Design an enzyme around this catalytic site. Sequence first.
Site, PDB file in Angstrom:
ATOM      1  N   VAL A  11     -36.675  20.075 -30.477  1.00 14.04           N
ATOM      2  CA  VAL A  11     -35.999  18.769 -31.633  1.00 14.04           C
ATOM      3  C   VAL A  11     -34.595  17.958 -31.591  1.00 14.04           C
ATOM      4  CG1 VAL A  11     -38.127  19.000 -32.939  1.00 14.04           C
ATOM      5  CG2 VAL A  11     -36.256  20.219 -33.548  1.00 14.04           C
ATOM      6  N   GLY A  12     -33.705  19.046 -30.824  1.00 10.47           N
ATOM      7  CA  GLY A  12     -32.454  18.609 -31.137  1.00 10.47           C
ATOM      8  C   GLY A  12     -31.370  19.511 -30.228  1.00 10.47           C
ATOM      9  N   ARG A  15     -23.556  20.576 -28.834  1.00 11.40           N
ATOM     10  CA  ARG A  15     -22.679  20.604 -28.257  1.00 11.40           C
ATOM     11  C   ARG A  15     -23.440  22.301 -27.697  1.00 11.40           C
ATOM     12  N   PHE A  16     -23.382  22.510 -28.910  1.00  9.78           N
ATOM     13  CA  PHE A  16     -23.310  23.998 -29.163  1.00  9.78           C
ATOM     14  C   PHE A  16     -24.652  24.935 -28.851  1.00  9.78           C
ATOM     15  CE2 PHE A  16     -19.336  22.629 -31.318  1.00  9.78           C
ATOM     16  CZ  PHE A  16     -18.591  22.952 -30.634  1.00  9.78           C
ATOM     17  N   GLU A  18     -29.432  24.274 -29.248  1.00  3.02           N
ATOM     18  CA  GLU A  18     -30.326  23.861 -29.183  1.00  3.02           C
ATOM     19  C   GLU A  18     -31.320  23.803 -30.906  1.00  3.02           C
ATOM     20  OE1 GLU A  18     -32.880  24.522 -25.273  1.00  3.02           O
ATOM     21  OE2 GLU A  18     -31.342  23.966 -24.416  1.00  3.02           O
ATOM     22  N   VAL A  19     -32.502  23.169 -30.814  1.00  5.17           N
ATOM     23  CA  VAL A  19     -33.060  23.302 -32.130  1.00  5.17           C
ATOM     24  C   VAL A  19     -34.600  23.189 -31.718  1.00  5.17           C
ATOM     25  CG1 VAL A  19     -33.216  23.336 -34.562  1.00  5.17           C
ATOM     26  CG2 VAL A  19     -30.880  22.606 -33.161  1.00  5.17           C
ATOM     27  N   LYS A  38     -32.665  27.777 -34.106  1.00  2.32           N
ATOM     28  CA  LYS A  38     -31.538  27.062 -33.792  1.00  2.32           C
ATOM     29  C   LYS A  38     -30.809  28.373 -32.786  1.00  2.32           C
ATOM     30  CE  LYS A  38     -27.248  23.935 -34.887  1.00  2.32           C
ATOM     31  NZ  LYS A  38     -26.309  23.874 -35.798  1.00  2.32           N
ATOM     32  N   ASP A 140     -18.134  17.445 -40.082  1.00  2.00           N
ATOM     33  CA  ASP A 140     -18.489  16.795 -39.201  1.00  2.00           C
ATOM     34  C   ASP A 140     -20.107  16.320 -39.234  1.00  2.00           C
ATOM     35  OD1 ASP A 140     -19.538  15.566 -36.489  1.00  2.00           O
ATOM     36  OD2 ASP A 140     -20.393  16.901 -35.667  1.00  2.00           O
TER      37      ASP A 140
HETATM   38  C1  LIG Z   1     -28.415  20.694 -36.093  1.00  2.00           C
HETATM   39  O1  LIG Z   1     -28.742  21.432 -36.847  1.00  2.00           O
HETATM   40  C2  LIG Z   1     -29.857  22.491 -38.066  1.00  2.00           C
HETATM   41  C3  LIG Z   1     -31.546  21.225 -37.929  1.00  2.00           C
HETATM   42  C4  LIG Z   1     -32.479  22.402 -38.276  1.00  2.00           C
HETATM   43  C5  LIG Z   1     -33.250  21.362 -38.930  1.00  2.00           C
HETATM   44  C6  LIG Z   1     -34.313  22.423 -39.640  1.00  2.00           C
HETATM   45  N1  LIG Z   1     -35.309  22.034 -39.851  1.00  2.00           N
HETATM   46  N2  LIG Z   1     -35.502  20.113 -38.880  1.00  2.00           N
HETATM   47  C7  LIG Z   1     -36.099  19.176 -38.244  1.00  2.00           C
HETATM   48  C8  LIG Z   1     -36.055  18.774 -37.145  1.00  2.00           C
HETATM   49  O2  LIG Z   1     -36.556  17.385 -36.812  1.00  2.00           O
HETATM   50  C9  LIG Z   1     -37.761  17.068 -36.777  1.00  2.00           C
HETATM   51  C10 LIG Z   1     -34.712  19.030 -36.729  1.00  2.00           C
HETATM   52  C11 LIG Z   1     -34.020  17.860 -35.515  1.00  2.00           C
HETATM   53  C12 LIG Z   1     -33.327  16.415 -35.982  1.00  2.00           C
HETATM   54  O3  LIG Z   1     -32.214  16.408 -35.879  1.00  2.00           O
HETATM   55  C13 LIG Z   1     -31.834  16.836 -35.619  1.00  2.00           C
HETATM   56  C14 LIG Z   1     -30.637  16.034 -34.060  1.00  2.00           C
HETATM   57  C15 LIG Z   1     -31.108  16.925 -36.562  1.00  2.00           C
HETATM   58  C16 LIG Z   1     -32.607  18.814 -34.923  1.00  2.00           C
HETATM   59  N3  LIG Z   1     -33.792  19.881 -36.977  1.00  2.00           N
HETATM   60  C17 LIG Z   1     -33.634  20.188 -37.658  1.00  2.00           C
HETATM   61  C18 LIG Z   1     -31.976  24.022 -38.571  1.00  2.00           C
HETATM   62  C19 LIG Z   1     -30.578  24.729 -38.206  1.00  2.00           C
HETATM   63  N4  LIG Z   1     -29.562  23.148 -37.894  1.00  2.00           N
END
Ligand SMILES: COc1cc(-c2cnn3cc(OC)c([C@H]4COC(C)(C)C4)nc23)ccn1
EC number: 2.7.11.30
Length: 304
Positions: A11-12, A15-16, A18-19, A38, A140
């Site tokens: 889902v993400g 730079r650091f 992957e989520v 993460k 940020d």
């Molecule tokens: C960015 O740092 C994070 C995010 C989560 C996180 C918790 N639920 N969730 C749901 C998401 O989408 C459905 C995303 C995507 C959406 O948008 C982003 C690019 C931020 C990632 N991230 C998370 C947990 C820990 N650190």
Amino acid sequence: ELLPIELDTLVGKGRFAEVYKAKLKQNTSEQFETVAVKIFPYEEYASWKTEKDIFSDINLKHENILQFLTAEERKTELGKQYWLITAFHAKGNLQEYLTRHVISWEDLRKLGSSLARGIAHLHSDHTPCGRPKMPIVHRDLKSSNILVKNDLTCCLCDFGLSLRLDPTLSVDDLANSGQVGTARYMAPEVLASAMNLENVESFKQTDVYSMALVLWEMTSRCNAVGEVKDYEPPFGSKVREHPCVASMADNVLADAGRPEIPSFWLNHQGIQMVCETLTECWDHDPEARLTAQCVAERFSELEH
Ligand SMILES: COc1cc(-c2cnn3cc(OC)c([C@H]4COC(C)(C)C4)nc23)ccn1
């Protein structure tokens, strides 16, 4: 012992790390639980450690701060990965949410007041009970990294560039970091390289300026204003998708440019209050900016 987790979807990508949306199958017999993982490679151990220190801080627990379950080190064939396991917010990031939806006035009130409350909590030198705590500056803040919970309130995360306001911090330590963060959301003083390095507390003002841009994004997509345009990021019309600092300096500092607020938006009393507030928050002069706590308080007055 490592939690029983199966990665489902990426889902993400940052730079650091992957989520991933993941399934925590603690129990084989019962329904699995949705969690967020993460993942940082060994090369990004520092970012993992900085976030971990924040998430595990008992003073940092708040409704508007992403809930943290645990941190793990997982050996892999290639090397090792550093994991942060947290609550998953299905709605996703604020930027994507605003792109896809036109929010109500009630939504804007909840989203804006909860964002200010989360930032105010990071900035606070004391816990609600009254105990001193060391302030954290996000550094940020942007719509792309603010999560939307199911109840339509904001939740902060992505603390890799965060700074603890430790008294022991040196100028050398701080200047070396220099301009850290996304250029699009940088305050004019940061774009100008005009900060007083000895004064760590002035970083709170930079967070407030970025928050003002996010508040403007929420406001832009609120149906209370009237006709709502398609979502555009702050300075979308002026700069390229991945703008440099020189180009942001040209707009924000040289031209004193800010995202446009049409006068018709002011017709609504609530929208007018939000616009005036956010306008004070993005002032060229950091001293002119309201504190996050002040903003949270104004949002409280919006019930009327
Ligand atoms: C960015 O740092 C994070 C995010 C989560 C996180 C918790 N639920 N969730 C749901 C998401 O989408 C459905 C995303 C995507 C959406 O948008 C982003 C690019 C931020 C990632 N991230 C998370 C947990 C820990 N650190």
